[PDB]
Amino acid sequence: GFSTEERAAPFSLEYRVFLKNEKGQYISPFHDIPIYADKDVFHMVVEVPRWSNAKMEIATKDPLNPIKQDVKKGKLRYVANLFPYKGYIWNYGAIPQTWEDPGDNDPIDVCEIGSKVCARGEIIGVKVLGILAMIDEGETDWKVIAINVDDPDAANYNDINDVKRLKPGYLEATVDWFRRYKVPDGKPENEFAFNAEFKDKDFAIDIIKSTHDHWKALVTKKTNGKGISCMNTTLSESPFKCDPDAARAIVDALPPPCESACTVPTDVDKWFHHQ
Ligand SMILES: [Mg+2]
Ligand SMILES: [Mg+2]
């Protein structure tokens, strides 16, 4: 289906993860992966495997939008181990061809709850089960809740109550994870500082389709891109389309693959307890 081309060493500053289609052509995971994998099955770009810490996401401003590691004041970012969790507690990522339009300014986020740990840059199909709406100091932050359609138990999951039923504690832990991530203190002062509520599958799909329409406007130049890189190699109706062979130079000009990988700071091991 899709595959990955990794440039430079993982957890280095130059590390990039580009996506390739069935034919070895470089494509943007933002723009060139269809939102739908099949009827009622959404594509998901996996950005971080469950239980990892590196904060890696689609580069919304880089040509071909490769996955790369976030950087804060010159240092590569890792999420904290929030006791009792190890790193991210879901496969975490995004639905391609969507754009929370400002809004967070990138593809709509997905928490994927299935049993398989997915790889960085892996493209999976997911069944949308619901959506977590969070108020973070007034702003709206959406997290789709989904499960790998290839999960052995996928047939048992069709709405958010199924998550409550067959994975007790998962939704609570999700809210807790995001609350302690956003308010490192622990508890916010009121529902403006942090609020959380889950909505069902139909609501989630309405939100997703809305962000897909916003993306449609983005890649057809009907809305200010606000710095988003819209270069793509497959969208026939997009003025930002570029010849695939021309786009290969974007990858080939970067350091070659090196899978003798940089070691992760020991500080990432530390576990932070809520007091
Ligand atoms: Mg988003
Ligand atoms: Mg986001």
Curated annotation (Swiss-Prot):
Domain of life: Eukaryota
Impact reported for residue 55 to N: In a breast cancer sample; somatic mutation
PROSITE patterns attached to this UniProt entry: PPASE
Cellular component GO terms held in the UniProt record: cytoplasm; cytosol; extracellular exosome
SUPFAM superfamilies named in the record: Inorganic pyrophosphatase (SSF50324)
Requisite cofactors: Mg(2+)
CDD domains according to UniProt: pyrophosphatase
Subcellular location: Cytoplasm
Expression by tissue: Expressed ubiquitously.
Subunit structure comment from the entry: Homodimer.
Protein name (database record): Inorganic pyrophosphatase
